[PDB]
Design an enzyme around this catalytic site. Sequence first.
Site, PDB file in Angstrom:
ATOM      1  N   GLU A  82       3.446 -21.350 -53.569  1.00  0.00           N
ATOM      2  CA  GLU A  82       4.851 -20.980 -53.659  1.00  0.00           C
ATOM      3  C   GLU A  82       5.083 -19.552 -54.103  1.00  0.00           C
ATOM      4  OE1 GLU A  82       6.603 -23.795 -56.275  1.00  0.00           O
ATOM      5  OE2 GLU A  82       5.917 -25.519 -55.113  1.00  0.00           O
ATOM      6  N   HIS A  89       2.360 -18.733 -56.919  1.00  0.00           N
ATOM      7  CA  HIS A  89       1.484 -19.655 -57.614  1.00  0.00           C
ATOM      8  C   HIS A  89       1.130 -20.896 -56.831  1.00  0.00           C
ATOM      9  CE1 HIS A  89       5.671 -20.500 -58.695  1.00  0.00           C
ATOM     10  NE2 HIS A  89       5.339 -21.775 -58.706  1.00  0.00           N
ATOM     11  N   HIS A  91       0.240 -24.785 -56.829  1.00  0.00           N
ATOM     12  CA  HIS A  91       0.423 -26.020 -57.571  1.00  0.00           C
ATOM     13  C   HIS A  91      -0.713 -26.870 -57.031  1.00  0.00           C
ATOM     14  CE1 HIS A  91       4.486 -25.839 -59.513  1.00  0.00           C
ATOM     15  NE2 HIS A  91       4.569 -24.770 -58.749  1.00  0.00           N
ATOM     16  N   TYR A 153       9.014 -33.301 -56.624  1.00  0.00           N
ATOM     17  CA  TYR A 153       8.955 -31.875 -56.927  1.00  0.00           C
ATOM     18  C   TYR A 153       8.393 -30.897 -55.913  1.00  0.00           C
ATOM     19  CZ  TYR A 153      10.090 -33.671 -61.549  1.00  0.00           C
ATOM     20  OH  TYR A 153      10.669 -34.311 -62.620  1.00  0.00           O
TER      21      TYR A 153
END
Length: 195
Positions: A82, A89, A91, A153
């Site tokens: 992202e 970063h 995830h 998320y």
Amino acid sequence: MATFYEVIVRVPFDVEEHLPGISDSFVDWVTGQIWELPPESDLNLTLVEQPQLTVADRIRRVFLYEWNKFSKQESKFFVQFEKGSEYFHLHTLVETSGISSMVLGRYVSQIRAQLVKVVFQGIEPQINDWVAITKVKKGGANKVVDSGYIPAYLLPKVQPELQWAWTNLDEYKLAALNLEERKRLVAQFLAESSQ
DNA sequence: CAGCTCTTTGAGCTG
Ligand SMILES: [Cl-]
Ligand SMILES: [Mg+2]
Ligand SMILES: [Mg+2]
Ligand SMILES: [Mg+2]
């Protein structure tokens, strides 16, 4: 169901600022890899920052390669790159199988050292907490989540915040690079959740 | 075509 740990890696996105003095070879590598969208994807490739993705993918593969040697199996994962408001970063959601919470910190620390060695030419990225394990609360144990974390998320991210995603979880293979599929799985998640 | 190689980790490519 399976359970997952999450590691967030802040990927260098400004060589002069994050990797001071690094060799030209790094620049040649990151700027030279051409990325193409698979036909199933419905993403807009012009919104994807390729040099950053090239680094993120290298980090991802080194991470999983080392992780698997620790877990002793081909661990399940869902990784999403992202472009945040302050940092790019990764995830990294990886299955807990074979890795106890007690030793996780040490294992991650070893992977960080390997990343520095084999990805950044021995140069430590000038980014604070560039490799961090998601905790229960600031000052607590390592957070453990289930797959529901993905539609809650990860899936709802759209471009340009969403840069790319990878997974070996069959349920999310089409979702990785398909916005329409992500939307479908999120809608289903919200429907079930409202009840 | 059996390995060698590459910001690899296994499969494309070549001697
Ligand atoms: Cl951010
Ligand atoms: Mg083994
Ligand atoms: Mg984020
Ligand atoms: Mg390959």
